[PDB]
Amino acid sequence: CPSQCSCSGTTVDCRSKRHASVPAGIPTNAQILYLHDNQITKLEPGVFDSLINLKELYLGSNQLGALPVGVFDSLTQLTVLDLGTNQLTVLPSAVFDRLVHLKELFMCCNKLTELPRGIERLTHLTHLALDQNQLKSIPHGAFDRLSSLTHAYLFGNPWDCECRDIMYLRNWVADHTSIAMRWDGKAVNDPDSAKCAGTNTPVRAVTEASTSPSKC
Numbered sequence: 315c316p317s318q319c320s321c322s323g324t325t326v327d328c329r330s331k332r333h334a335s336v337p338a339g340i341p342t343n344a345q346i347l348y349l350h351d352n353q354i355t356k357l358e359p360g361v362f363d364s365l366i367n368l369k370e371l372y373l374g375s376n377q378l379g380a381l382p383v384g385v386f387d388s389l390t391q392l393t394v395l396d397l398g399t400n401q402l403t404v405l406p407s408a409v410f411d412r413l414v415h416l417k418e419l420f421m422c423c424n425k426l427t428e429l430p431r432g433i434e435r436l437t438h439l440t441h442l443a444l445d446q447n448q449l450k451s452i453p454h455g456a457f458d459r460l461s462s463l464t465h466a467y468l469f470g471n472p473w474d475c476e477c478r479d480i481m482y483l484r485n486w487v488a489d490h491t492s493i494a495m496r497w498d499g500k501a502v503n504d505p506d507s508a509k510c511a512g513t514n515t516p517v518r519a520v521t522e523a524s525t526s527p528s529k530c
């Protein structure tokens with residue numbers, strides 16, 4: 315068992331141990347790896363390659379500024395991926411590609427400005443968390459294939475209701491009011507939680523006429 319970690323069968327728990335990098339010696343039979351709440355500043359190319367039976371991976375609350383290309387390619391059985399509370403800005407376009415069975419994707423509280431490419435194809439997603447980033451909008455159709463969504467976290471983004479290309483997210487929240495969630499120390503259903511930048515007005519209440527294709 316790795317230094318400053320605890321191991322119980324297939325669970326490897328290294329949360330809250332001031333790790334400055336992913337620790338060597340992680341058992342390859344591990345199905346759950348808690349690495350959240352450290353100050354891991356980078357992931358080494360290949361760091362997870364050996365862990366091909368991994369099902370849940372938590373990397374929340376670290377110092378991740380970037381993800382290496384293919385860092386998650388080995389984890390074809392992965393169902394939970396938590397990346398919330400890092401310093402992420404841009405992701406590699408195919409970083410989620412192999413995660414065809416992913417059900418929970420947590421990415422809150424980073425510095426994202428566009429929806430990361432790939433999210434569109436993760437059809438088994440039940441949870442998707444994008445709250446507290448810097449997204450101005452959502453590309454048209456990005457949620458079409460995500461027909462298993464029960465929780466969507468969209469609050470705390472500078473949504474741009476001036477632009478007509480908010481109308482997808484507008485329409486989408488109105489059509490899925492029940493999966494629209496805010497966070498009150500837990501999950502709370504709130505179709506209004508997603509709000510326009512500046513005005514603090516609910517995104518789903520945005521009117522077709524109130525927008526302009528020439529103000530984006």
Ligand SMILES: C[C@@H]1O[C@@H](O[C@H]2[C@H](O[C@H]3[C@H](O)[C@@H](O)[C@H](O)O[C@@H]3CO)O[C@H](CO)[C@H](O)[C@@H]2O)[C@@H](O)[C@H](O)[C@@H]1O
Binds near residue numbers: 374
């Ligand atoms: C750190 C936390 O981040 C936001 O809370 C989000 C919440 O984070 C979970 C996190 O996934 C979990 O690994 C950690 O151990 O506990 C957090 C709960 O506090 O996850 C939900 C979605 O599941 C939301 O995205 C939350 O926004 C932030 O809102 C909290 O204040 C807190 O800083």
